[PDB]
């Protein structure tokens, strides 16, 4: 009996699966391409950690994230697989419950991480409190057509403070601010579409985790997780926060995960 974890979003969330490689089973959770390859960590990512570390019965991983991704490139634009079209695949492959991936509605768990792109790149372009709500409005339509598949169990992460990676620390505290407070509003217009969408459902279940402050809490005292400091880069993913410039390390990945676990038990797979 498992849990069928259709995942979306970015280079946060990455492992390069393939939807024409090899596909989930039992002994093979992630599918493709081997659990820890693909990632931008060094290792496995919160997706594979999830999976196959702090999964409380079988889990399948089929993850539909993409890096450059932002939620749809009419309204901010960078690569060409945007989370729109991650979902688009998911409609072309997975939609239909095929053999392969025989889920409904009490067994398929909709995880999307997204909007890292969209604020770094229109938060000194846009204003915040009125294109915000235009970004989480085009996400509610994309989940609208997977709750019309028959998806009743959802999982958004908020947006996590990339304004404080070495990327944004080098251009100066007033951008790091200026990322910050557009963030601050995304966030909170995300929250309110999720709740929103739960009660005017009445049928979902629906986790928001809120990554911003667990990420926040070891930016602001790192020694206390590990880490020497809050912004050191090291690539083998373990010895800094970040694996580069822009992206945090399987270290930190397996910390969100096993703080993420708690929170995801009424979903089914922890």
């Not at 200026?178 to 009445?202: C, P, R």
């Not at 050191?232 to 676990?261: F, R, V």
């Amino acid at each position: 009996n498992p849990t069928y974890f259709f995942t979306f979003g970015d280079s946060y969330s990455q492992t390069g699966f393939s939807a024409s490689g090899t596909q989930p089973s039992a002994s093979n959770p992630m599918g493709n391409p081997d659990l820890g390859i693909g990632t931008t960590t060094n290792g496995p990512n919160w997706i594979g950690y999830l999976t196959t570390t702090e999964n409380a019965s079988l889990v399948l991983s089929y993850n539909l994230a993409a890096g450059g991704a932002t939620i749809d490139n009419a309204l901010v634009p960078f690569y060409p697989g945007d989370l729109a079209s991650q979902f688009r695949l998911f409609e072309d492959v997975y939609a239909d419950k095929p053999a392969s991936a025989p889920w409904s509605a009490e067994d398929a768990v909709f995880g999307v991480w997204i909007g890292i792109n969209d604020i770094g790149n229109a938060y000194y372009s846009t204003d915040a409190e009125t294109y915000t709500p235009k970004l989480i409005s085009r996400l509610e339509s994309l989940v609208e057509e997977v709750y019309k598949n028959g998806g009743r169990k959802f999982l958004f992460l908020n947006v996590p403070p990339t304004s404080r990676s070495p990327l944004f620390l080098e251009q100066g505290e007033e951008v790091v601010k200026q990322h910050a407070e557009y963030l601050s509003v995304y966030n909170e217009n995300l929250e309110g579409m999720v709740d929103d969408f739960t009660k005017k459902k009445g049928d979902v279940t629906t986790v928001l985790y809120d990554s911003w402050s667990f990420m926040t809490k070891i930016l602001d005292d790192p020694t206390a997780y590990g880490f020497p400091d809050a912004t050191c880069i090291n690539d083998d993913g373990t010895s800094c926060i970040w694996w580069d410039n822009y992206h945090p390390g399987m270290k930190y990945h397996l910390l969100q995960a096993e703080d993420m676990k708690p929170k995801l038990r009424k979903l089914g797979g922890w």
